[PDB]
Design a protein around this ligand. Structure first.
Ligand code: CUA
Ligand SMILES: [Zn+2]
Length: 122
């Protein structure tokens, strides 16, 4: 369906799975990692996102401020990030390297330079 759906935008940064960025990547299965991503103006947390190749990655993305976009360059990952809502996208990276995350939802003056990075390890 699935897990995360609704969240509180006012406390997302201090209580819960997105509050501590050191803990953003959580193993949730024998070959599966959940990554709690905060899309905010203007950037992504954590940065970089580090994940192993071949593992199913479950991205859980929300915003503490306005609507953003979460698009990973070179992939079909393309989702809307709404405040108060959790966007869930599942993906298995099968090539190591650095991927760029870009915002494709105009979110204010820093929109252009709102970028993130995912490093897929070997
Ligand atoms: Cu975030 Cu545009
Ligand atoms: Zn693209």
């Amino acid at each position: 369906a699935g897990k995360l759906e609704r969240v509180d935008p006012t406390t997302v940064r201090q209580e819960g799975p997105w509050a501590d960025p050191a803990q953003a990547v959580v193993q949730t299965g024998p070959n599966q990692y959940t990554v709690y991503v905060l899309a905010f103006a203007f950037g992504y947390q954590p940065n970089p996102i580090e994940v192993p190749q071949g593992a199913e990655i479950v991205f859980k993305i929300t915003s503490p401020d306005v609507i953003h976009g979460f698009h990973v360059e070179g992939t079909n990952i393309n989702v809307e990030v709404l405040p108060g809502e959790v966007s869930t996208v599942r993906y298995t990276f099968k090539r190591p390297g650095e991927y760029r995350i870009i915002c494709n939802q105009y979110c204010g003056l820093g929109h252009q330079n709102m970028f993130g990075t995912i490093v897929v390890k070997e």
